[PDB]
């Protein structure tokens, strides 16, 4: 069952959709201030973030209004009347199967709801840093914290110490790590493009990696398949990606769009 997005999940989606975009910096600054315009790159950013958070379902070609409701119930406590308004409006404003999954169709379908509940949506998806302390303390060690690496988070959650050794880790630990890396998707599928990307960035992208274990289509099975193509390489790749999971971006960066993003979120 779809759970309310944590700040780890929203930050992952915001940052990854930003870096996958070739849009201008001025456009990306508008996005981190929560007002994407109607240009194609902005429409595709909204579609990307919506899909990554599983708010838009491309198989059914539909927004999932009930997930916006569940997000508001968990994370919007600033205004009971605005909470009830979102509950009443979500289904009528977001209902309907779209003719296609184009960025234009998804953005246009979202537009009325987004305009009507702008400040509520911003807050419930962790856009306002006045809430950041309460949000991370309510979730505690149930969410990966800013600056915490995913392997450490998964080791604690499963009560398992991983020595980067010959031992065979428990399936619950592997599942936690691979889902944090998005090697296994939220739906449980193998994400071979992500695996290949991390192998290549670690310098382990070789021809005898073949399909990167896309054939396996279970966390144990993926781990066993990758380890059989080179155990030392697999440890190296996991370590390399792990370091990059601590800070999705630098909250103290003075480069754009990061500086504008933090300034906006800090002073609402």
């Amino acid at each position: 069952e779809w759970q309310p997005r944590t700040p780890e999940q929203t930050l992952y989606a915001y940052v990854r959709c930003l870096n996958d975009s070739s849009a201008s910096i001025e456009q990306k600054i508008n996005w981190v201030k929560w007002h994407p315009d109607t240009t194609y790159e902005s429409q595709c950013y909204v579609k990307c973030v919506s899909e990554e958070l599983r708010l838009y379902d491309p198989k059914e070609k539909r927004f999932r209004p009930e997930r916006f409701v569940l997000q508001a119930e968990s994370f919007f406590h600033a205004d009971p009347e605005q909470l009830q308004a979102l509950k009443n409006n979500a289904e009528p404003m977001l209902a309907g199967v779209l003719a296609d999954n184009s960025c234009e169709s998804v953005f246009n379908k979202y537009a009325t709801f987004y305009a009507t509940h702008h400040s509520t949506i911003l807050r419930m998806f962790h856009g306002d840093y006045r809430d950041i302390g309460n949000t991370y303390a309510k979730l505690g060690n149930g969410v990966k914290q800013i600056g915490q690496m995913f392997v450490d988070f998964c080791e604690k959650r499963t009560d398992f110490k991983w020595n980067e050794d010959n031992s065979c880790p428990p399936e619950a630990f592997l599942d936690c790590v691979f889902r944090g890396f998005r090697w296994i998707t939220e739906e449980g599928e193998v994400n071979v493009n992500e695996i290949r990307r991390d192998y290549e960035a670690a310098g382990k992208g070789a021809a005898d990696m073949a399909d990167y274990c896309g054939s396996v289509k279970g966390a144990r099975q993926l781990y066993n398949c990758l380890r059989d193509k080179g155990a030392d390489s697999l440890v190296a790749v996991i370590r390399d990606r792990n370091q990059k999971t601590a800070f999705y971006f630098d909250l103290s960066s003075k480069e754009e769009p990061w500086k504008s993003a933090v300034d906006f979120a800090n002073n609402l």
Copy 2:
């Protein structure tokens, strides 16, 4: 010396006292909204929670008003006038030795103070999630966090890595773990009913466990249990440890848990 209750200590008391009660879900929903009525199960819930937090002392048969004062000085910063009202009312409203420790006697003694300072008591005992970030950050790694297991917390606190093997752990680590499990009480006594509970839940309950070391310090308790089967002891610790992460599921849609979260989120 009694220290102001952490959110770990209050959440432990609230949940354990709820799960010990046979009251109806409708009653428990009222309790997690801080609205105990006067039925017997409600009176016993209030007594249970007060005793677990060491606010009511059954050996002396009295509330400890100075402990409510200390809790307010630590965790109530929202209204200076309501803080001073509580400090001046606690002793006159709560002091006095009771004729017995019955649920009715404890609840009735608490009633005027609770009615007069309801919203202050709620907030200073971590009932208002508007404060949850400041409270857990001020305590830091000094308190077990939501979702953290007690063994991890105790390993960090004592700078000890436990390999769950044949090593004999340092006493400060054992004391920390046993007190987190409430195998050793706040007063330092062995809590045999909790040890037995955890052995049975792990499938390691046996007749050779005998008295579960009631005859027995944390080193003494550890040595006594390990002498009855070292592998069983590790299995029991590991099984209870998994249960110390989330005292209840804050995402649960079952009652009373769903009402507990919605109320505390939206004051």
Copy 3:
């Protein structure tokens, strides 16, 4: 590049400068209420805290007004007008080379800026516990938490498990630990007085320790030199100091000035 001071760095400076002072408890109580007076002991405390936070540079004999601005941009979100006022006043009020580094010279240079912006300064340097949750959440595991020991923090930050044995630890881990102990200063220099103090506090002071490795050039160089004077002794000192890094003072203490410090920071 100088980074905005974390609450770990401000608490370290506040506590160490207090315990270094022989001033009376009545004076120290005024200091923890952000009310230094003009006595020599108070002037010296302000200078000590300013140097420890790298806000005053004794080598160039000047305050660094731009570092106050950077601190305010990071940690003061309560009043745009007071933020802008601080930004405009920092350089005119604080810039200028002093004739000497005396307590009187540093305090007098700081005094007008402080009298003018004291409430904003308090807040941006972590003096108001209404902010404490948001601050530690936004920094996350990138800062040592209250109650956390420095070796643990440094193990997680570098993804290294230290077994306190024969192993040769990675340099990034050594640098993190030594800098947290202030054995290596923020400028990268060996702090021999701090090393000797911790050796003595652990009962490992001895004539063979000689200059306590003040001669060396690098965290690896300092570690190799200390280990060569006695490996077991070095582990014991690290373990002893590590215990003391969890709680810089007892936030539940009823002794002064600790009690008034907590009382003041809680009820602003």
